[PDB]
Amino acid sequence: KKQATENLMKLLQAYKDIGDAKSEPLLKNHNPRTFEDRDYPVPDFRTQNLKAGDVPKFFDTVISTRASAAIASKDKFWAGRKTEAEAASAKASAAFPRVAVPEWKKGKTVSIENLNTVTDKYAAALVPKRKLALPVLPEGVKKAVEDFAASVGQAKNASEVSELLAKSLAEKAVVTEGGKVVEGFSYVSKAVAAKVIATRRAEVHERLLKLWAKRLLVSPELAIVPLNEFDAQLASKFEGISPKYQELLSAVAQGNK
């Protein structure tokens, strides 16, 4: 089991090395969209002799075939990646650090000064390898600026005059890697990136609202075939389309008189 874990840790180093030599994105090969073929010949439902309710079941098995063939193409990537890393796993370094356990000799005891430096090694890996230097304002400088505002007489608003000094360093907080500041490191946060998504969702949803605005200004009878029951009507020929809504759509199209 120690050798299986050293084999797995050497394998996950081989995966990280030959994926950083190829410089590939992290999520690219785990995304099965990237193994999907968009230039497939896309089978036409008008040449497959479908009846009225048969077209959405045709669409589902063209999709789920093309999705299964992208998943099975992702599996063929990773099964070929595995043998590429297992070949380099066999020629690897195997110089890993050991798990910090408290030192226990054969007949001796365990000192608490060694149980505690082991616990220091567990809580020194709880810090992240690259972190924002998010500054807390100490009370040694939050009072030296509070009473400087209270010597001028802003002791009633002495709460807010400190928080702006806290936030002005918090907002341009720099990142530190190993205690040293890596400089020229711009990060896009998770509240910025969720604002890029929320505006991009609103500018595509208003194109859907503008799409259906034109189709219901010209042809307002389209609002009587519900959107889920639409391709349940289709067929391969136009005469095969289900007449559930045909005679209703023709009479709503003629107007309100």
Binding site: K28, P128, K131, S189, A194, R207
Partner: protein, 103 residues
């Protein structure tokens, strides 16, 4: 909800933080607005820990967990990952925008 239950209570209003997550500055100021009850909970737990090994272990864990510089930011840690997790939703929207440009 569970990540923010420890700060905003039980009626956390998870809709507000799903839509607009809190910035790295608001994660800081939610750390600092519970730190006095966090350093006093750890001191009340280290006093009633079963042994002086566990008493050091609940203060050393809180000495790391109460520092706001130790909050792991995935965008700071893995910058190429959080841009690619952005382009999973920007590519899902772009496929809905190509469908409306074709229409």
């Amino acid at each position: 909800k569970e990540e923010l239950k420890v700060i905003y209570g039980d009626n956390v209003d998870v809709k507000h933080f799903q839509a607009s997550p809190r910035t790295p500055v608001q994660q800081l100021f939610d750390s600092l607005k519970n730190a006095a009850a966090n350093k006093e909970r750890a001191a009340k737990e280290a006093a009633a820990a079963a042994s002086p090994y566990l008493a050091y272990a609940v203060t050393k864990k809180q000495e790391v967990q109460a520092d706001p510089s130790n909050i792991p930011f995935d965008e700071v840690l893995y910058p190429q990952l959080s841009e690619e997790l952005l382009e999973l939703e920007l590519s899902d929207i772009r496929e809905d925008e190509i469908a409306l440009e074709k229409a």
